[PDB]
Amino acid sequence: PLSILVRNERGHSNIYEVFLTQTVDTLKKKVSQREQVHEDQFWLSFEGRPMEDKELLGEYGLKPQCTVIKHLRLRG
Amino acid sequence: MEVKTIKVFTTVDNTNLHTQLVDMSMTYGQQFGPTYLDGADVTKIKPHVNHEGKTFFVLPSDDTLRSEAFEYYHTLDESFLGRYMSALNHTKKWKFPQVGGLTSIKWADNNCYLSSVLLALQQLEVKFNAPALQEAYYRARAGDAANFCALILAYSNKTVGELGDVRETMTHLLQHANLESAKRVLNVVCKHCGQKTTTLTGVEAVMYMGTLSYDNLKTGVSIPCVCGRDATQYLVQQESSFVMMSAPPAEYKLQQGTFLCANEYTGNYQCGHYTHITAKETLYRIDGAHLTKMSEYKGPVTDVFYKETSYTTTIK
Ligand SMILES: [Zn+2]
């Protein structure tokens, strides 16, 4: 029931089908899977707000065709 | 026949420690109520042999403290207080040396990234809206930082011992910061698609990824455009106390008087090390407790901070 765009910081973007009631963890798994990057190795924001693994995607107010940003995490 | 068990320490106030044997066939939640470890909620997991010797924070399911949490921490996460206090059990064993006139942290538990965060914040005209958060910030500026670091782990959803990313941590913290009148206007120009103006507020107004140079962003930076072509983006207008400019760690030159401070990152994405560079009368490099000074500097940098008040470009 919702299609959104996840955009890398290296330019690329990919479409994901999500429900507002899946977790951020779930969506990270969808992204890990599609983009072949471990889940520990990146984070997601929506409109400046970091997305927390445990939270439902709905909490961030995602709409159809909105852009979630994928950020590579430096493991310092 | 004996029951599989481990010895762990338990505490409801971070001062008093009681020894406990835990039964391996039941979650901690079944045995102690709501229970936390290293900043994680372990209420619903079973004991693991590796938890032996660890200290656990137990915090009864009360929901009176839910009102406390909201008003003092600006959070509705019921797990927040427990995560915060279990972390605090560790961060109280961290040492906080006063180095080059700032509070820093002695190496332990992969806390180099939190050291950078702490060092950087002290130089920014910034402030936090969550009362307990601000008070902790205040105290960390005076050398008493255990609480602030635990809140940082907690607001960022990190555990003690976990490798981390300064930019990612800053993004979590700044959600709680006094940035309600921070403002940024960017113009994007694509030959094919044309010209479009973007107005940002809050965190997104003071934070940028793609270049370490505040000059580059004013004079224009290349960004991919919807149409596939590369387009130019530049800073139209900026009203804020500071800006944070980030980029994948690259070899980079820091010249005294052209920046506030910055984070060096050595290593690779899988495992690395942060140190902090600030500018007083000369350049200071802070690597936890260890300090080096130098008139100039060159190395792998990934965030650079600048002081700001108001900016207006001189391009159309
Ligand atoms: Zn275009």
Curated annotation (Swiss-Prot), chain A:
GO terms for biological process, alphabetical: defense response to bacterium; defense response to virus; integrin-mediated signaling pathway; ISG15-protein conjugation; modification-dependent protein catabolic process; negative regulation of protein ubiquitination; negative regulation of type I interferon-mediated signaling pathway; negative regulation of viral genome replication
Any idea where the Ubiquitin-like domain is? Answer: 1-76
- Which compartment or compartments is the protein found in? Cytoplasm; Secreted
Enumerate the UniProt keywords alphabetically: Antiviral defense, Cytoplasm, Disulfide bond, Isopeptide bond, Repeat, S-nitrosylation, Secreted, Ubl conjugation pathway
Q: Explain the post-translational modification.
A: S-nitrosylation decreases its dimerization, thereby increasing the availability as well as the solubility of monomeric ISG15 for its conjugation to cellular proteins.
Question: Which molecular function terms from Gene Ontology are attached?
Answer: integrin binding; protein tag activity
Principal cellular location given in the protein's record:
cytoplasm
Interacts with activating enzyme (site feature) positions: 73
**Entry GO terms, CC:** cytoplasm; extracellular region
Q: Which residues carry this modification: S-nitrosocysteine?
A: 66
Q: What induces it?
A: By type I interferons.
Record motif LRLRGG, residues: 72-76
Record's keyword annotation contains ATP-binding: no
List the residue ranges of the region (Involved in the ligation of specific target proteins).
Answer: 73-76
Source organism superkingdom: Eukaryota
Q: What does this protein do?
A: Ubiquitin-like protein which plays a key role in the innate immune response to viral infection either via its conjugation to a target protein (ISGylation) or via its action as a free or unconjugated protein. ISGylation involves a cascade of enzymatic reactions involving E1, E2, and E3 enzymes which catalyze the conjugation of ISG15 to a lysine residue in the target protein. Its target proteins include SERPINA3G/SPI2A, JAK1, MAPK3/ERK1, PLCG1, TRIM25, STAT5A, MAPK1/ERK2 and globin.
What do we know about how this protein assembles, alone or with others? Homodimer; disulfide-linked. Interacts with, and is conjugated to its targets by the UBE1L (E1 enzyme) and UBE2E2 (E2 enzyme). Interacts with NEDD4. Interacts with PARP12; this interaction inhibits PINK1/Parkin-dependent mitophagy.
User: What's the record's remark on domains?
Assistant: Both the Ubiquitin-like 1 and Ubiquitin-like 2 domains are required for its efficient conjugation to cellular proteins. The two domains play different roles in the ISGylation pathway: Ubiquitin-like 2 domain is necessary for the first two steps allowing the linking of ISG15 to the E1 and E2 enzymes while Ubiquitin-like 1 domain is essential for the final, E3-mediated transfer of ISG15, from the E2 to the Lys of the target protein.
Q: What is this protein called?
A: Ubiquitin-like protein ISG15
Q: Name the source organism.
A: Mus musculus
The part of the entire sequence present here spans 79 to 154 of 161
From Swiss-Prot, chain B:
Q: Which residues form a coiled coil?
A: none
Summarize the impact of residue 149 to A: No effect on PL-PRO activity
Q: Which residues form the Peptidase C16 domain?
A: 72-316
| Consequence of substituting residue 227 to A | Complete loss of PL-PRO activity
* Residue stretches making up the Ubiquitin-like domain: 3-58
Zinc finger (C4-type) positions are 190-227
Residues the entry annotates as binding Zn(2+) 6: 190, 193, 225, 227
The active site annotation covers 112 (for pl-pro activity), 273 (for pl-pro activity), 287 (for pl-pro activity)
What is this entry's stated membrane topology?
Multi-pass membrane protein
Which locations, inside or outside the cell, does it occupy? Host membrane; Host cytoplasm
The reaction(s) catalysed by this protein are: Thiol-dependent hydrolysis of ester, thioester, amide, peptide and isopeptide bonds formed by the C-terminal Gly of ubiquitin (a 76-residue protein attached to proteins as an intracellular targeting signal)
State the needed cofactors, names only. Answer: Zn(2+)
Function, in words: Responsible for the cleavages located at the N-terminus of the replicase polyprotein. In addition, PL-PRO possesses a deubiquitinating/deISGylating activity and processes both 'Lys-48'- and 'Lys-63'-linked polyubiquitin chains from cellular substrates. Plays a role in host membrane rearrangement that leads to creation of cytoplasmic double-membrane vesicles (DMV) necessary for viral replication. Nsp3, nsp4 and nsp6 together are sufficient to form DMV.
Q: What is known of its domains?
A: The hydrophobic region HD1 probably mediates the membrane association of the replication complex.
The protein in question is named: Papain-like protease nsp3
Organism, by scientific name, is Severe acute respiratory syndrome coronavirus (SARS-CoV)
Q: Which residues of the full protein are shown?
A: 1541 to 1855 of 7073
